[PDB]
Amino acid sequence: NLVQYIRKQYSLQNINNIQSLLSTLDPFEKTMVKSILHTMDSSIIPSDDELLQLADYLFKVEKWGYYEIILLGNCVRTIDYNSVFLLTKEMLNNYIYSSLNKTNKRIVTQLAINCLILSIDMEEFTNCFYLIDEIKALLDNELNFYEQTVFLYATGYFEFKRWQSTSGIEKMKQAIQVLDILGEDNLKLHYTIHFDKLINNK
Amino acid sequence: NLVQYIRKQYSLQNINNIQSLLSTLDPFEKTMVKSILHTMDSSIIPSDDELLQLADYLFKVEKWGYYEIILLGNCVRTIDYNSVFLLTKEMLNNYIYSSLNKTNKRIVTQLAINCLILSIDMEEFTNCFYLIDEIKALLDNELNFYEQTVFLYATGYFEFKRWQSTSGIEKMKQAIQVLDILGEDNLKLHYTIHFDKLINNK
């Protein structure tokens, strides 16, 4: 109920089914939804005013809980990048977590990695350096192998787009191999095509 | 405080430091501690009476929370196997979890896998078949890559000890490769030596 019907229908790729929830929610959950459909139907756009309002809310949030983290993470590619990076930078320093429930640590790590991928896309390499050290501390002495695999690919992506280095190639191919070994075919194929485009477009 | 000083001192291998807590606790946390030191000092043995009392408590536990799961998991190799398997079988069917906090799902999965490794050790192959299907359901449509890697090695271990099959060899070597790729050197080396003994002793 929380966000289950979100990703449940995202599994089936039924656009018109949670598009049905434009008319329950709040305005922030309404924009979080709209930016998700921007990935499905590339013309369902949350325009700036509803994005600037959620971004302003997150800017004055003092403590980041599950509510704020899921809201930001779902709109990392619709809120303007300059705000997303600052909000990510603030979420990293103010997310609520103790040692029983580390669920907030996971999705914060997944968010920081997704923002790192976006930072590589925008060629914000100074911001990539910051996020790389923040993610390594989130992963260190933890057993978050999924985030470690995505972070390894993102590290190779950063090293490739910046230098076309052989080392960045190997990191990306090693992360794909982890997904291959663990039977994660859908993730492996999406990361393979992303890798194919990188080398086959230069 | 909960179990931090347990694994914190376990990182430093300081035996005499949480051995200091035999004289805070309850009798169940006292036996959970004692069986942990049985891995360090192989003569610090929790004798049967304190093990049968915790095992009896877990047998009548109606709902398995973080308390019961951590108690069983730390004594899977000191409580008699016949009880450990039945308790694992009951924990799988009665562990408390909802969709925000899936921490109980993780350590239940890690427990079931550790009991699977012990079941392979005891040549309880009928019990291995049961645990394999239970772990696959716990992992399915989840992103628990660490448990997936350990479960893959355990699957290859089961297939090797039962048939010395080439397929079991590959699964174990692939799980070691995941640990190698993700920089998990300590886990990779422990799993490598375990793998070395399997093939170099037949």
Residue in the structure block whose two tokens are 């787009």:
A161
Beta bridge partners of B64: B95
Task: Please give, rounded to a whole number of angstroms, the shortest distance from the CA of B49 to a CA of chain A.
Answer: 30
Integer CA distances (angstroms), A147 to A15, A112, A186, B51, B74, in order? 27, 10, 16, 38, 27
The two most distant CA atoms of chain B are separated, in Å, by 51
What is the SS3 assignment for A18? helix
> Closest Cα partner for B28 from B70, B88, B91?
B70
Alpha-carbon distance B162 to B150, whole Å?
18
Question: Which 3 state secondary structure label does DSSP give B95?
Answer: strand
Contact yes or no for B144 and A148 at CB 8 A: no
Helix (H) or strand (E) holding A27: helix A27-40
Structural domain count, chain A: 1
What single DSSP character describes residue A100? S
Resolution (in Å) of the shown entry? 2.2
The two tokens of residue A165 are 């280095």
Residues of chain A contacting B69 with CB distance shorter than 8 Å: none
Which residue among A4, A103, A148 places its CB closest to the CB of B182?
Answer: A148
Quick one: how many helices (H) and strands (E) in chain A? Answer: 11, 0
Question: Do the Cβ atoms of B117 and B135 come closer than 8 Å?
Answer: no
Cα A123 to chain centroid, rounded: 16
Question: ∠ CA B17-B23-B29 to the nearest 5 degrees?
Answer: 80
Question: Across the interface, do B103 and A100 touch by the CB < 8 Å criterion?
Answer: yes
Cβ-Cβ contacts under 8 Å, B4 against chain A: 99
Considering only CB atoms, which residues of chain B are within 8 Å of chain A? 2, 4, 66, 99-103, 143-146, 148-149, 152, 174-175, 177-178, 181-183
Inter-residue contact A10 to A36 (CB < 8 Å): yes
Instruction: Please compute, for residue A15, the number of CA atoms within 13 A of its CA located in the half-sphere on the CB side.
Output: 10
* Distance to chain A for B116, nearest Cα, Å: 18
Q: Is A95 helix (H, G, I), strand (E, B) or coil?
A: strand
Residues in chain B: 202
**Domain span holding position B191:** 1-201
Calpha distance A113→A121 (Å, rounded): 12
* Distance, CA of A180 to CA of A86 (rounded, Å): 34
Contact B145 A175 (CB under 8 A): no
Give the DSSP per-residue string, B35-68: HHHHHHSTT----HHHHHHHHHHHHH-SSB-HHH
Q: What is the rounded distance in angstroms from the CA atom of residue A174 to the CA atom of residue A153?
A: 8
Nearest C-alpha neighbor of B54 from the set B95, B26, B82: B26
